[PDB]
Symmetry: none
Subunit: 96 residues, 2 copies
């Protein structure tokens, strides 16, 4: 099943694990390496990385945040997601 794609999905699942909105510093040191993983993958995954990031961002945007701290956590989560996406797009060459 082209297991590189499987490991890209595994990294997506790891992004699902680390969640300022949901989880609320285990996902702080490796998370930077975990997000650098996708940042580097964007140069090679391209379409798959974009699709995964877009799905994550849409899921974050399509939320409720009824509580008080939930909105504050989602504010940081969406900012981090957008920064990662922008870095991935900047890294991705125009030849893609």
């Amino acid at each position: 099943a082209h297991r590189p794609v499987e490991w890209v999905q595994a990294v997506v699942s790891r992004f699902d694990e680390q969640l300022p909105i949901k989880t609320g510093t285990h996902t702080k040191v490796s998370t930077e390496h975990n997000k650098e993983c996708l940042i580097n993958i964007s140069k090679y995954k391209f379409s798959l990385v974009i699709s995964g990031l877009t799905t994550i961002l849409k899921n974050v945007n399509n939320m409720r945040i009824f509580g008080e701290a939930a909105e504050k956590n989602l504010y940081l989560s969406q900012l981090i997601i957008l920064d990662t996406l922008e870095k991935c797009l900047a890294g991705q060459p125009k030849d893609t």
Copy 2:
């Protein structure tokens, strides 16, 4: 049998033949008869008697070399007590042959594989059934057999396996008149196996030489051995060292890394989702990036490369010890092989 072996001071070839025939009959009964509890103990006793009787046979006894293959066949039965007895017999046989100065002018493959050639008809069938074709890779097949020593429950057998690997590597290096820790076509397997444990092997390793390991088959076998050693392992330092070596090899040999990934799939999935070691993650991340980089490897760069090489068992053999399952499966080949060995040397 054990009492006689420990007590006796001088043996005869007829005694060795009788012991081998007793072992063959016990193995044949174990495959058919359901009373394995006694047949297994008799097999272990027969092996233990030989482990003591061998150092007493004449210097011209042709059974010295056949004892090695008897030990290999015993280790192929996949029984913890039987495996321990086989490992002890292997250590004794290697020590006796070294003291007899029989490896001075020959390599381990040169000596050991020479005596099996006369009766290679059943041996080839057994190897095909197991997936340990010595004619394809003698050293790699021996290493794959000895790999279970790390998996043995008893901590004493692990040290014996390590010592056996040390002796094999030293003999192989000295056969070509080179350095002990000199990476070569043959020494690669034992160097890889001993790297996870030996401190000195972790110093002189580079490990994934490109000028030497030009053959794709040897590199693929080394990668498969490392993957098998890392899949069932649990040591943190060993896991880190193996992951670093695998990342370095994938950087150096991206073409072959595509095949060894099938076995490492479960380990990568477990690590990439749960493991939180940045040092371990970084080599794994580089390996994943290299895998994503290339998407053109054909089936010849897949598991069929080893399967067509007749070494499909290295990814399954070294696993955890079973519970009296395959003892009767390959007993017929083992019994027939033992009968053939006795016929040609008695």
